[PDB]
Structures are given as structure tokens and as C-alpha cells.
Nucleic acid binder design. Structure first.
Ligand SMILES: [Mg+2]
Ligand SMILES: [Mg+2]
Ligand code: NA
Ligand code: NA
Ligand code: NA
Length: 326
DNA sequence: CCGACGGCGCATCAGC
DNA sequence: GCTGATGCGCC
DNA sequence: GTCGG
């Protein structure tokens, strides 16, 4: 990556603002700048040069000049030495522990992996599982393993009901060589925006995957979204594969394109595209794209028959999944 | 200057 | 119990 | 922190 030092700096700042400062808009600002810089095809020579890019402002330009000149950022150097900031940042690496719980734990004297392990009864279910698999959840998933996981999920889903369609989204669908977790969009013709003609549609699928020992734990689960843990089977004498995060989202079948647009991401691409939609007088979620009335109230869902239809409404040329890794 | 910044599912909790 | 606010998660 | 009105 041409500007890796700068993008790392901005990502670290973003994480600080999110985890410690609890300043969600500064977090988003920093990530937006990191992302636009990441795709810039030149090795940046100055803050001024960077400031030409949408999302990079005066303050980031100044940090960029400091970083280019010295290879570091004093602001970050100090943050890295601050024990409370260090502690809070670490604790938030556990799935289920956010900025608030992290600060609360540090208040109570719980601030290391050892502290967490001996205070399991101070954790909710989600946090308990995040702790259990702390190491595993920070590992990436090789695309080769994602393919094996895809094969199991698609085949087991088929065994439940041949009418289900499961689609692997997230970075996998963007063609990444490695993924952070597995994202599965699920549809069934019994569940549309007009009616739910069959209950337990998501449950049946979760059950089957648990039955074949693919899903190993559950972080949360409702009628349309499952958030849990899974694991590839290993062969005789073979070391086990790491446990992996899996998210499954059941989406009304007639709203598949908005759903797959959403679940394909990236997250920054979605924020950027949805913000552009608003500027264009539309609102996009995982279900529909709707016009904004003169008052700002969302109108009725617009007809959508492809991902491209959505791009057309907001006057964007189509971008294939592989070009949405912002 | 200053309001807006994407949108929503599930878990947990307060107030009634 | 329900409703609404908040935390945390997903892209 | 950055942007647009
Ligand atoms: Mg993912
Ligand atoms: Mg992600
Ligand atoms: Na700029
Ligand atoms: Na966390
Ligand atoms: Na995911």
C-alpha cells in the first residue's frame, strides 16, 4: 500500500475517538479520510496534496505533514502511553465489550485478559463468548477456508429446504483473499415484504448448522438476524481450525437486491453511498430505496430489479462488488 | 457559522 | 408485561 | 473532523 503509514495513523486515531473519546462522528471522519487516502494512487508528498481529497481537512493535513516529516504523531505517542486509554482500547477488542462497558470495567479494576478470565460472571453472554474466542476472532479467514465454509452452509441450507437461497456477502463477495468473518444473506419465498407464510425460517437453518457442528455458539439471535460462531471440521490427527464469527441475515425475498447491496458493503462504501442518496433526495436501507418528500418524510419504495437499479436512482455508475472495498 | 453526518437488528434496562 | 432509550453489533 | 449551504 502506497500510503500505509498515513492510513494506519488515521485508523489508530479513529479507534481512539470511538473507543476512548466516544466521539462517533470523529471516528467516522477519520475512517472516511483513511479510506479515500487508501485508494489514492500516488505516494502522498504533503498534507496539502492530501487535503485535495474529499474527507481530508485542515487538521488531518497537519497531522499528515507531521507524520511525513518525523514518521510519527506526537498525539498518538502520548495516547499510547496513557494507561486508561490503553486499557480501554484493549477491552474493546473483545466482541460485546464496547466503549461504555470498557470504561466501566476499568473503573472496577478489570483491565487485562487475566482480569476478564477470572471475572466471567461479570460478563453478559455475548461478552463471555467474545472472551472465550478472543484470539481466534482476531485471525483472518483465508479465502480457501471461506470457500469450504460456503460449501457447508449452502449444502446444509439446501437439505433443510431446497427453496432457501444462501448468499455469502461481506468481503468474500467483494473478492477479498481473506475475510474477517462469514456473512450470509438468506432468503426463502415464504418470507416477503408482504407476508411471513412460515415461522422459524432462520431458526430451522441455525438448528441444522448446529446439528452438523458447524455453528458452535450464539452471540445473539432473533427472527431475522443470527450472530454467532462457527468452525470448519478438521480431519484425523489434524489441528483444529480457529473458531470464526458468522452472521446470517434473513431478508424478504422480494427485497434481495437492497439486501445484498447492504450486506456486500464495505461499511464505508455503504455510508458513502447512502449519504450520496440523501444528497440526491433518496434514502437507502437493506430493504428499499425511497424518495424523500419535500418535508423529508420517506415516500414509497421504488421498483428495484437489480443492484444496478439502485445505483441508477442516485446517478452513480455501477460498481462491481470488487470495487466497493472502501 | 453550524447542522448534519447511514440505517437498522438484538440485548439490556428504566419507567410505568 | 410494554415502550422507549441506550449499548453494541453488522455491512 | 469535514462538508455544504
Ligand atoms: Mg464480514
Ligand atoms: Mg466489518
Ligand atoms: Na479535502
Ligand atoms: Na468490542
Ligand atoms: Na459479519
Amino acid at each position: 500500500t502506497l500510503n500505509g503509514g498515513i492510513t494506519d495513523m488515521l485508523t489508530e486515531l479513529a479507534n481512539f475517538e470511538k473507543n476512548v473519546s466516544q466521539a462517533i462522528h470523529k471516528y467516522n471522519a477519520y475512517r472516511k479520510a483513511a479510506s479515500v487516502i487508501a485508494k489514492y494512487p500516488h505516494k502522498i508528498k504533503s498534507g496539502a496534496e492530501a487535503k485535495k481529497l474529499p474527507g481530508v481537512g485542515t487538521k488531518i493535513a497537519e497531522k499528515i505533514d507531521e507524520f511525513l516529516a518525523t514518521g510519527k504523531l506526537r498525539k498518538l505517542e502520548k495516547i499510547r502511553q496513557d494507561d486508561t486509554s490503553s486499557s480501554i482500547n484493549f477491552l474493546t477488542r473483545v466482541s460485546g465489550i464496547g466503549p461504555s462497558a470498557a470504561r466501566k470495567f476499568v473503573d472496577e479494576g478489570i483491565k487485562t485478559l487475566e482480569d476478564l478470565r477470572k471475572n466471567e460472571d461479570k460478563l453478559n453472554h455475548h461478552q463471555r463468548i467474545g472472551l472465550k474466542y478472543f484470539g481466534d476472532f482476531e485471525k483472518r479467514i483465508p479465502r480457501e477456508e471461506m470457500l469450504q465454509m460456503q460449501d457447508i452452509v449452502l449444502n446444509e441450507v439446501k437439505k433443510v429446504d431446497s427453496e432457501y437461497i444462501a448468499t455469502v456477502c461481506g468481503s468474500f463477495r467483494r473478492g477479498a483473499e481473506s475475510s474477517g468473518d462469514m456473512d450470509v444473506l438468506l432468503t426463502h419465498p415464504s418470507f416477503t415484504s408482504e407476508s411471513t407464510k412460515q415461522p422459524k425460517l432462520l431458526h430451522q437453518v441455525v438448528e441444522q448448522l448446529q446439528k452438523v457442528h458447524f455453528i458452535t455458539d450464539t452471540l445473539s439471535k432473533g427472527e431475522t438476524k443470527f450472530m454467532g460462531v462457527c468452525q470448519l471440521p478438521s480431519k484425523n490427527d489434524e489441528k483444529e481450525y480457529p473458531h470464526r464469527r458468522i452472521d446470517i441475515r434473513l431478508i424478504p425475498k422480494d427485497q434481495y437486491y437492497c439486501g445484498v447491496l447492504y450486506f456486500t458493503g464495505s461499511d464505508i462504501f455503504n455510508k458513502n453511498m447512502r449519504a450520496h442518496a440523501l444528497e440526491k433526495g433518496f434514502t437507502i436501507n437493506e430493504y428499499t430505496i425511497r424518495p424523500l418528500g419535500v418535508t423529508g418524510v420517506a415516500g414509497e419504495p421504488l421498483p428495484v430489479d437489480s443492484e444496478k437499479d439502485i445505483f441508477d436512482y442516485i446517478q452513480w455508475k455501477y460498481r462491481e462488488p470488487k470495487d466497493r472495498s472502501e
